[PDB]
């Protein structure tokens, strides 16, 4: 388990591992979304600036969208949006520990928009419900 | 507390202060991490843009590890990770009021990577433990 048997998991190393086994690999993925050009004329001057801003605002796009759902500052959160039987007719035992994340996104790629819209509507539903009980 | 004893801390004014007195001063050192270029050709089309995007990337780097540890948005976060006594054999009374924070960072400069990586290893376990008790 140690020495040559120790596992450091690299970067993107959970691509072939199952969905249950990849539930503890969330940390190493997120740390590679900003760094890389930490050490340093038209050619290769604007090419870094175009790439640096693009690598930042896409991260802010995925972080602002997390904050609209109420998932800011958390990696594994879960809401009260009921996903229904039409989206995937499989139980939890047929999803987690027998297949990986890479081709799971292909069946949900049609239903990505319908999932994303209900989460931002459900968070604003419970913000006003917090206002009624607090007063 | 008035006259010569009034508070005019400004930016970085608690640099040589004791840790108890400097613990009140974390608010004023946060806002001067993005501003200063709030108001506005080869020269300075790169000399200004390269330093402005660098301040963005350094700020989001500090916030992101503050999010991986699970307590982003908090100025004083105190988590539930035990610390080894080999890093510093000083008690509470020999740290917070007798010495300046600047020389303290050099003492734990070697042991920074041990304690920076142990925080997220006890946070993914914390989020996994939160999932079991919730359901």
């Amino acid at each position, epitope marked *: 388990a140690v020495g*040559i048997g*120790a596992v*450091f998991l690299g970067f993107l190393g959970a691509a072939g591992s199952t969905m249950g086994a990849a539930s503890m690999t969330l940390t190493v993925q997120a740390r590679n979304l900003l760094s890389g050009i930490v050490q340093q004329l038209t050619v290769w001057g604007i090419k870094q600036l175009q790439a640096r801003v693009l690598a930042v605002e896409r991260y802010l796009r995925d972080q602002q969208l997390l904050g609209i759902w109420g998932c800011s500052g958390k990696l594994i959160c879960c809401t009260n949006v009921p996903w229904n039987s039409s989206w995937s007719n499989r139980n939890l035992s047929e999803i987690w520990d027998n297949m990986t994340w890479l081709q799971w996104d292909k069946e949900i790629s049609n239903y990505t928009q319908i999932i994303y819209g209900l989460l931002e509507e459900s968070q604003n539903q419970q913000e006003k419900n917090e206002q009624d009980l607090l007063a | 507390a008035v006259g010569i004893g009034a508070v005019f801390l400004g930016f970085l004014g608690a640099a040589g202060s004791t840790m108890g007195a400097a613990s009140m001063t974390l608010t004023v050192q946060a806002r001067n991490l993005l501003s200063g270029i709030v108001q506005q050709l080869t020269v300075w089309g790169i000399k200004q843009l390269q330093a402005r995007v660098l301040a963005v990337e350094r700020y989001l780097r500090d916030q992101q590890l503050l999010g991986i540890w699970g307590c982003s948005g908090k100025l004083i976060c105190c988590t539930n990770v035990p610390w080894n006594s080999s890093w510093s054999n000083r008690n509470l009374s020999e740290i917070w009021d007798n010495m300046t924070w600047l020389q303290w960072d050099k003492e734990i400069s070697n042991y920074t990577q041990i304690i920076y990586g142990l925080l997220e290893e006890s946070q993914n376990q914390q989020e996994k433990n939160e999932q079991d008790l919730l359901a």
Partner: nanobody
Amino acid sequence: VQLQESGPGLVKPSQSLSLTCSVTGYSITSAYYWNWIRQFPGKKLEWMGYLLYDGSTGYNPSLKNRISITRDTSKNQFFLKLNSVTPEDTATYYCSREGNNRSYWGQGTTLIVSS
């Protein structure tokens, strides 16, 4: 990765032994285990200690407190210091990197402990 050992080839008894491992082709602040391993006359290997990627330490108990292992992350080098040497500690010293079913060894260097 390439590893290259350097240091004095002759050390007087009871004095301290210092060796440098110069690493190229890989960063010592990212992953795997970074080891010192020595080979005695008669082709016997004894493990002295290791390092974690975060700079944690560990040593073979048989060497007691005789070993401190240290590093310089600016130069991407790590270092061996061995106190209170004896002529039975004369051996060929390797710095090796091990993990993920990938084991790489340096070319080694020779040291003689004599007066």
